[PDB]
Amino acid sequence: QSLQTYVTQQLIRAAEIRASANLAATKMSECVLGQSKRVDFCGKGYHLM
Amino acid sequence: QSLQTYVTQQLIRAAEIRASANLAATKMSECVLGQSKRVDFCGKGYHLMSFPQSAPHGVVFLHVTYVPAQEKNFTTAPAICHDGKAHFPREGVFVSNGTHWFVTQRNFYEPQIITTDNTFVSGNCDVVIGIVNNTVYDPLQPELDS
Amino acid sequence: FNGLTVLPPLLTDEMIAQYTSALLAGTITSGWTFGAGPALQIPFPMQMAYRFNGIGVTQNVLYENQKLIANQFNSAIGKIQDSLSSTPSALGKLQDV
Amino acid sequence: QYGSFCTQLNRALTGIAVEQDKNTQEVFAQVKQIYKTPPIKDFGGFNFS
Amino acid sequence: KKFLPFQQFGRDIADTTDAVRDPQTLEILDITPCSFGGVSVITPGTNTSNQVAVLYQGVNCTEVPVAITPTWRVYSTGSNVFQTRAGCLIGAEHVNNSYECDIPIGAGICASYQTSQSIIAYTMSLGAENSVAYSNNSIAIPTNFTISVTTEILPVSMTKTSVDCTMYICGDSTECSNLLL
Ligand SMILES: *[C@@H]1O[C@H](CO)[C@@H](O[C@@H]2O[C@H](CO)[C@@H](O)[C@H](O)[C@H]2NC(C)=O)[C@H](O)[C@H]1NC(C)=O
Ligand SMILES: *[C@@H]1O[C@H](CO)[C@@H](O[C@@H]2O[C@H](CO)[C@@H](O)[C@H](O)[C@H]2NC(C)=O)[C@H](O)[C@H]1NC(C)=O
Ligand SMILES: *[C@@H]1O[C@H](CO)[C@@H](O[C@@H]2O[C@H](CO)[C@@H](O)[C@H](O)[C@H]2NC(C)=O)[C@H](O)[C@H]1NC(C)=O
Ligand SMILES: *[C@@H]1O[C@H](CO)[C@@H](O[C@@H]2O[C@H](CO)[C@@H](O)[C@H](O)[C@H]2NC(C)=O)[C@H](O)[C@H]1NC(C)=O
Ligand SMILES: *[C@@H]1O[C@H](CO)[C@@H](O)[C@H](O)[C@H]1NC(C)=O
Ligand SMILES: *[C@@H]1O[C@H](CO)[C@@H](O)[C@H](O)[C@H]1NC(C)=O
Ligand SMILES: *[C@@H]1O[C@H](CO)[C@@H](O)[C@H](O)[C@H]1NC(C)=O
Ligand SMILES: *[C@@H]1O[C@H](CO)[C@@H](O)[C@H](O)[C@H]1NC(C)=O
Ligand SMILES: *[C@@H]1O[C@H](CO)[C@@H](O)[C@H](O)[C@H]1NC(C)=O
Ligand SMILES: *[C@@H]1O[C@H](CO)[C@@H](O)[C@H](O)[C@H]1NC(C)=O
Q1: Between chain E and chain A, are at least 3 CB pairs below 8 A?
Q2: How far apart are alpha carbons D34 and E6 in whole angstroms?
Q3: If you placed Cys at B125, which of B86, B105, E94, E147 could pair as Cys (CB 3.0 to 4.6 Å)?
């Protein structure tokens, strides 16, 4: 039972980490490799680089 | 206990599939129903259009993009000083092939004669660093003289 | 020691640093062109003028105020070291995981 | 006597382990060549040190 | 460890006795687990060949020959064994040349099967080196273009599955269902 509880909580945390990593990849593609017009996506103000 | 384990794993996998389906719906809305400006969202390069294609338990997108092919070396100048005034291109970049200067669009080589309808005058040519030093043409004057 | 092992990541820290250095060098020397296709060099002030046009400000504004813009950027990039060092909770997101 | 309770736990942990490397690869490996800055720092007054 | 005269054991994580005192000679000797790890088999497809390489994960492998008839031990002693941060790899040859990774191992080490042909181990290459000819008055603008089409594949839906609880647990039985309620 202890092992099963550990594995379930690890799966949930891994899913959350994967969502965060997808957001980071999107930010690297859009803010760094280009200039984004999306408001507040790459910081407060008008994004430059 | 076996049934409970199966149900929990199914719930987690269903959450993952739902995230993927939301991403697919967003891509269908933004790449197929319009032209997207976000970088790398609808393929590698400059997005032109996309076409959907159904697959078993999924979808396939064919992303048509624009890729530059053959580049060349040139020399630039931020501005042009002609009569004590600094000229900046309205849209494009000042470019030189060694002897003359032209204005071309940034994404494709298409040289043009520097005229008053390609450039705008702003301020004086004493402030810009690296300004280059040439002649601009006003097409109205030759017509008036003739 | 009771059946628990930690596996090393496939990419070492030096490889991640090399990736970030390549991204930074590409951004500095070619703007956004290295992301679409082949990298094309462009002087950094001209790239900044392109960005200013992108945010809706005409490009002669940057050429008339180049020194002030450079000084402001240098001061701003200097401040962030102290900003992140002074506050312990700046990097909390990694510490929590 | 409990069947295959043990195999699923190891399988799930291995899946998480593979997903972590996938996350790192998808975030950082966005460039196909390695670029280097020139030795000269003539950036018009911009200091990237 | 400086034991107090009245103490016998030593516990740091409260479930393992890391140290103990010898009953006859009052000396203190620590206890450590012998060795353990996972065994992974690096292999190309049964298309390409039948040669394999074995990785003993996270172990010093002066100990490998005497770990655990299927007693290959050092499977190919001629194949130079060498430690990595993931363990030591047995059955592969170290190569200085770097390539793109195809079979990841760990800590930047990758393995592949190539030409005669054998399994080799190398450090992965991050990509072809390049240098942009930067100067303060030089530009590069394209003179042509190409049109390219790329595919992207996304799963959308799963298989709709329903499971009956009573039929699975207590199929066609009344006593079992009465106990289950
Ligand atoms: C740079 O471009 C200019 C503009 O085309 C070239 O000047 C012309 O050269 C052609 C020869 O191919 C002549 O027939 C034209 O009379 C020239 N025009 C003018 C206004 O002089 C120039 O030769 C090019 N320079 C180089 C080095 O390629
Ligand atoms: C472009 O042409 C003008 C010529 O009118 C150059 O202006 C001269 O600049 C020098 C240096 O300060 C002065 O001593 C002269 O008095 C200027 N000429 C006049 C008529 O005032 C200008 O230097 C040229 N641009 C460049 C970048 O060399
Ligand atoms: C770029 O900025 C750094 C500061 O981050 C400069 O390094 C300073 O150099 C001066 C004198 O050269 C020293 O007194 C400072 O102690 C240095 N600071 C640090 C943090 O090392 C560097 O000189 C600048 N480079 C250019 C080309 O302007
Ligand atoms: C731009 O590139 C295209 C290639 O995609 C060139 O088209 C080729 O031109 C050669 C001879 O010039 C032909 O033999 C090929 O059959 C053409 N390919 C296709 C697909 O039609 C084109 O000429 C280039 N344009 C310039 C101005 O250089
Ligand atoms: C542009 O000039 C640089 C100078 O080092 C050179 O390396 C490069 O090959 C040139 N490109 C072309 C297309 O001539
Ligand atoms: C470019 O750098 C050269 C030195 O290599 C210098 O003489 C020239 O003034 C610089 N031009 C600009 C516009 O910064
Ligand atoms: C008592 O201990 C000593 C060594 O500590 C050992 O040599 C001896 O045999 C022990 N006594 C008996 C009766 O075995
Ligand atoms: C696997 O082996 C068979 C036997 O020759 C071959 O025909 C098949 O194409 C191989 N698979 C691949 C993906 O090449
Ligand atoms: C364990 O491996 C290291 C090298 O990583 C070596 O220096 C050491 O001697 C090894 N230990 C034993 C007991 O062989
Ligand atoms: C790589 O080359 C170095 C010499 O530069 C040598 O010392 C080393 O043993 C070589 N390693 C391999 C795996 O070939």
Answers
A1: no
A2: 64
A3: B86
Ligand nearest to the CA of E45: 8
C63 with B127: Cβ contact below 8 A = yes
Coil, helix or strand at residue B79: coil
What is the Cα–Cα distance from C90 to E140, expressed in whole angstroms? 41
Chain E: nearest CA to C54, how far in angstroms? 19
Which residue's C-alpha comes closest to atom 28 of ligand 2? Answer: B133
Nearest CB to A33; choose among B8, B12, B40: B40
For tokens 């516990």, what's the residue?
E11
10 Å Cβ neighbour count for E138? Answer: 16
**Backbone phi, then psi, for B20, in 5-degree steps?**
-60, -40
| Residue E156 per-residue DSSP state | -
Resolved by = cryo-EM
DSSP chain C: --S---PPPSS-HHHHHHHHHHHHHHHHHHTTHHHHSS-----HHHHHHHHHHHTT--THHHHHTHHHHHHHHHHHHHHHHHHHHH-GGGGHHHHH-
Give which of B38, B78, E116 is closest to A27, Cα–Cα: B38
Token output for C48? 């900044």
Interface of B with A in 23-52 (CB under 8 A): 37-41
Q: Which two structure tokens, joined as six digits, stand for E70?
A: 């299927």
CA–CA dist E131, E136 (Å, integer): 15
Burial of E54 (0-12, 13-18, 19+ CB in 10 A): buried
Q: Is E133 in the pocket of ligand 5 (CB under 6 A)?
A: yes
How big is chain C by its Cα radius of gyration, in Å? 20
| Cβ-based contacts of B44 with chain C (< 8 Å) | 36
B57 shares contact with chain E (CB less than 8 Å): yes
Q: Do D44 and E127 touch (CB under 8 A)?
A: no
Consecutive H or E run containing D34: strand D33-34
Chain-chain contact of D45 with C66 (C-beta, under 8 angstroms): yes
Token digits for E44?
């190309």
Hey, what's the torsion of the CAs at E10, E11, E16, E21, to 10 degrees?
Answer: 0
What gap in Å lies between CA B64 and CA E16, rounded to an integer? 62
Scored b (16 or more CB within 10 A) or e, B37-56 reads: bbbbbbbbbbbbebeeeeee
Breaks, C-N > 2.5 A, in chain E lie after: 68, 115
